[PDB]
Design an enzyme around this catalytic site. Sequence first.
Site, PDB file in Angstrom:
ATOM      1  N   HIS A  89       0.724  -1.445   0.199  1.00 30.62           N
ATOM      2  CA  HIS A  89      -0.106  -0.012   0.463  1.00 30.62           C
ATOM      3  C   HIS A  89       1.050   1.443  -0.200  1.00 30.62           C
ATOM      4  O   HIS A  89       0.637   2.351  -0.263  1.00 30.62           O
ATOM      5  CB  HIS A  89      -1.239   0.404   1.124  1.00 30.62           C
ATOM      6  CG  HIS A  89      -0.711  -0.008   2.338  1.00 30.62           C
ATOM      7  ND1 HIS A  89      -0.430  -0.315   3.720  1.00 30.62           N
ATOM      8  CD2 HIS A  89      -0.648   1.596   2.618  1.00 30.62           C
ATOM      9  CE1 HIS A  89       0.345   0.373   4.503  1.00 30.62           C
ATOM     10  NE2 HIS A  89      -0.657   2.022   4.319  1.00 30.62           N
ATOM     11  N   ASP A 103      -0.647  -7.346   2.125  1.00 29.46           N
ATOM     12  CA  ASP A 103       0.336  -5.961   2.326  1.00 29.46           C
ATOM     13  C   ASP A 103       1.312  -6.412   1.531  1.00 29.46           C
ATOM     14  O   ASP A 103       1.532  -5.507   3.189  1.00 29.46           O
ATOM     15  CB  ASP A 103      -0.519  -5.031   3.220  1.00 29.46           C
ATOM     16  CG  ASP A 103      -0.432  -3.445   3.279  1.00 29.46           C
ATOM     17  OD1 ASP A 103       0.153  -3.031   2.090  1.00 29.46           O
ATOM     18  OD2 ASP A 103      -0.630  -2.882   3.608  1.00 29.46           O
ATOM     19  N   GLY A 146       2.266   6.688   9.071  1.00 34.32           N
ATOM     20  CA  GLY A 146       3.690   7.034   8.736  1.00 34.32           C
ATOM     21  C   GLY A 146       4.835   5.580   9.229  1.00 34.32           C
ATOM     22  O   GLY A 146       5.917   6.333   8.420  1.00 34.32           O
ATOM     23  N   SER A 198       3.801   2.825   7.953  1.00 34.62           N
ATOM     24  CA  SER A 198       3.638   1.468   7.139  1.00 34.62           C
ATOM     25  C   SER A 198       4.060   1.361   6.712  1.00 34.62           C
ATOM     26  O   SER A 198       5.829   1.850   6.270  1.00 34.62           O
ATOM     27  CB  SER A 198       2.367   2.389   6.062  1.00 34.62           C
ATOM     28  OG  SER A 198       0.930   2.388   6.620  1.00 34.62           O
ATOM     29  N   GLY A 199       4.707  -0.257   6.353  1.00 30.54           N
ATOM     30  CA  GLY A 199       5.920  -1.249   5.667  1.00 30.54           C
ATOM     31  C   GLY A 199       6.939  -1.204   6.384  1.00 30.54           C
ATOM     32  O   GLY A 199       7.542  -2.447   6.443  1.00 30.54           O
TER      33      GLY A 199
HETATM   34  C1  LIG Z   1      -3.172  -0.682   3.779  1.00 28.76           C
HETATM   35  C2  LIG Z   1      -5.281   0.018   4.505  1.00 28.76           C
HETATM   36  C3  LIG Z   1      -5.896   0.784   3.320  1.00 28.76           C
HETATM   37  C4  LIG Z   1      -5.789   1.857   2.319  1.00 28.76           C
HETATM   38  O1  LIG Z   1      -6.148   2.717   3.019  1.00 28.76           O
HETATM   39  N1  LIG Z   1      -4.585   1.915   1.973  1.00 28.76           N
HETATM   40  C5  LIG Z   1      -3.743   2.905   1.562  1.00 28.76           C
HETATM   41  C6  LIG Z   1      -3.095   3.288   1.103  1.00 28.76           C
HETATM   42  C7  LIG Z   1      -2.549   4.282   0.040  1.00 28.76           C
HETATM   43  C8  LIG Z   1      -2.273   5.088   1.424  1.00 28.76           C
HETATM   44  S1  LIG Z   1      -0.845   6.389   1.532  1.00 28.76           S
HETATM   45  O2  LIG Z   1      -0.642   7.521   2.195  1.00 28.76           O
HETATM   46  O3  LIG Z   1      -0.325   6.936  -0.169  1.00 28.76           O
HETATM   47  C9  LIG Z   1       1.039   5.893   1.670  1.00 28.76           C
HETATM   48  C10 LIG Z   1       1.614   5.590   2.745  1.00 28.76           C
HETATM   49  C11 LIG Z   1       2.272   6.270   2.328  1.00 28.76           C
HETATM   50  C12 LIG Z   1      -2.345   4.840   2.862  1.00 28.76           C
HETATM   51  C13 LIG Z   1      -3.307   4.385   2.829  1.00 28.76           C
HETATM   52  C14 LIG Z   1      -2.539   5.645   3.941  1.00 28.76           C
HETATM   53  N2  LIG Z   1      -2.739   5.123   5.371  1.00 28.76           N
HETATM   54  C15 LIG Z   1      -3.902   6.033   5.715  1.00 28.76           C
HETATM   55  C16 LIG Z   1      -2.629   4.284   5.832  1.00 28.76           C
HETATM   56  O4  LIG Z   1      -1.181   3.886   5.392  1.00 28.76           O
HETATM   57  C17 LIG Z   1      -2.925   3.751   6.705  1.00 28.76           C
HETATM   58  N3  LIG Z   1      -1.860   2.603   7.400  1.00 28.76           N
HETATM   59  C18 LIG Z   1      -1.722   2.094   8.822  1.00 28.76           C
HETATM   60  C19 LIG Z   1      -0.949   1.467   8.948  1.00 28.76           C
HETATM   61  C20 LIG Z   1      -0.865   0.798  10.655  1.00 28.76           C
HETATM   62  C21 LIG Z   1      -2.046   1.306  11.756  1.00 28.76           C
HETATM   63  C22 LIG Z   1      -2.329   0.599  12.522  1.00 28.76           C
HETATM   64  N4  LIG Z   1      -1.285  -0.174  13.968  1.00 28.76           N
HETATM   65  N5  LIG Z   1      -3.099   1.002  13.724  1.00 28.76           N
HETATM   66  C23 LIG Z   1      -3.909   1.824  13.633  1.00 28.76           C
HETATM   67  C24 LIG Z   1      -4.203   2.617  12.037  1.00 28.76           C
HETATM   68  F1  LIG Z   1      -4.804   3.659  11.660  1.00 28.76           F
HETATM   69  C25 LIG Z   1      -3.120   2.448  11.415  1.00 28.76           C
HETATM   70  C26 LIG Z   1      -2.609   2.892  10.021  1.00 28.76           C
HETATM   71  C27 LIG Z   1      -4.398   2.652   7.254  1.00 28.76           C
HETATM   72  C28 LIG Z   1      -5.477   3.170   7.431  1.00 28.76           C
HETATM   73  C29 LIG Z   1      -6.554   1.942   7.329  1.00 28.76           C
HETATM   74  C30 LIG Z   1      -6.286   0.851   6.011  1.00 28.76           C
HETATM   75  O5  LIG Z   1      -7.102   0.513   5.841  1.00 28.76           O
HETATM   76  C31 LIG Z   1      -8.220   0.826   6.585  1.00 28.76           C
HETATM   77  C32 LIG Z   1      -9.002  -1.027   5.920  1.00 28.76           C
HETATM   78  F2  LIG Z   1     -10.381  -0.223   6.795  1.00 28.76           F
HETATM   79  F3  LIG Z   1      -9.635  -0.269   5.311  1.00 28.76           F
HETATM   80  C33 LIG Z   1      -5.401   0.735   5.323  1.00 28.76           C
HETATM   81  C34 LIG Z   1      -3.986   2.273   5.953  1.00 28.76           C
END
Ligand SMILES: C[C@@H]1CC(=O)Nc2ccc(S(=O)(=O)C3CC3)c(c2)CN(C)C(=O)[C@H](Nc2ccc3c(N)ncc(F)c3c2)c2ccc(OCC(F)F)c1c2
Lengths: 250, 55
Positions: A41, A90, A186, A188-189
């Site tokens: 992602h 992912d 932030g 992520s990865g």
């Molecule tokens: C990958 C999944 C689906 C999606 O939205 N894809 C997605 C695609 C691109 C981007 S980007 O910015 O171009 C990229 C990072 C540079 C993002 C997201 C940015 N972003 C919101 C994120 O990267 C965030 N990541 C995280 C990671 C770990 C977390 C944790 N451990 N606790 C609480 C959080 F909120 C945690 C949150 C996240 C929140 C909800 C979620 O999906 C929610 C699901 F319901 F769909 C997902 C990821």
Amino acid sequence: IVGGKVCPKGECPWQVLLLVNGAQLCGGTLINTIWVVSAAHCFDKIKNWRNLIAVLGEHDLSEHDGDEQSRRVAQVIIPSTYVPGTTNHDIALLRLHQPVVLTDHVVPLCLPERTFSERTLAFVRFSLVSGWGQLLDRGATALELMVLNVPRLMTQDCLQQSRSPNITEYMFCAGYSDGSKDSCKGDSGGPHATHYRGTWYLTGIVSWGQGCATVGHFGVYTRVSQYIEWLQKLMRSEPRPGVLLRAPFP
Amino acid sequence: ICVNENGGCEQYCSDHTGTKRSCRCHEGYSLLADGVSCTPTVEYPCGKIPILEKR
Ligand SMILES: C[C@@H]1CC(=O)Nc2ccc(S(=O)(=O)C3CC3)c(c2)CN(C)C(=O)[C@H](Nc2ccc3c(N)ncc(F)c3c2)c2ccc(OCC(F)F)c1c2
Ligand SMILES: [Ca+2]
């Protein structure tokens, strides 16, 4: 990272910082001198594939101390089963253009064998998660690398303890439901690293959640043990032209 | 044998035809004569922290 501490300089030597046009993008994990494991992602919104940089030996973003090593990312390999904007599968495997040099500040994390990871590592309760992500929900990101110890839960236990998509066999929950400690977007990865008999191994990737450190929710991590064979086969393959590669999974 | 306490292995465990078990190590390590322990063969083995090891 919310509710953790600064990782003492050199104590997280496998941590990678990914940059796009010089701006913070995501974390990653070094697994040997040329390969980095990150989250698929992280690359959903990339248009400038030639401006992707991986930094090893990083600690403090405000100062250059000489231990940092920057490399261009030559290839980003994502499983065919990953769908942009969704949660499943992912994972990304990154080939660096030139190897990093191993030093006291740059060391790979062990990528374990599948059997050892499923039979033994999966039952080690606590593991470390790290990154330069948000220090608070809706807050500033960290200038120094942060680290947090989190306990792993069985998926039946995560579902019953939580207040939303499914947690698949390609994921696992880790952390706390009281809103005090978690990894953030932030981060992520970045690595979820497990200690076993004196050595650290890669078991998870910071993937998703429902708001950082929000009550009733745990952090969700990519289950790396499902991808060992997929990763090993790709690391034995020849580079292909073009940065992004979609590779069949399984 | 490998399913129980990692077959006594420090790192990897392989089950064999009968009550036989072989421990193995990640690259950058070699197996000791005890048949279970892994020792580094390189300066920067994976999953070890140099500033903590040198202490
Ligand atoms: C990958 C999944 C689906 C999606 O939205 N894809 C997605 C695609 C691109 C981007 S980007 O910015 O171009 C990229 C990072 C540079 C993002 C997201 C940015 N972003 C919101 C994120 O990267 C965030 N990541 C995280 C990671 C770990 C977390 C944790 N451990 N606790 C609480 C959080 F909120 C945690 C949150 C996240 C929140 C909800 C979620 O999906 C929610 C699901 F319901 F769909 C997902 C990821
Ligand atoms: Ca620095």
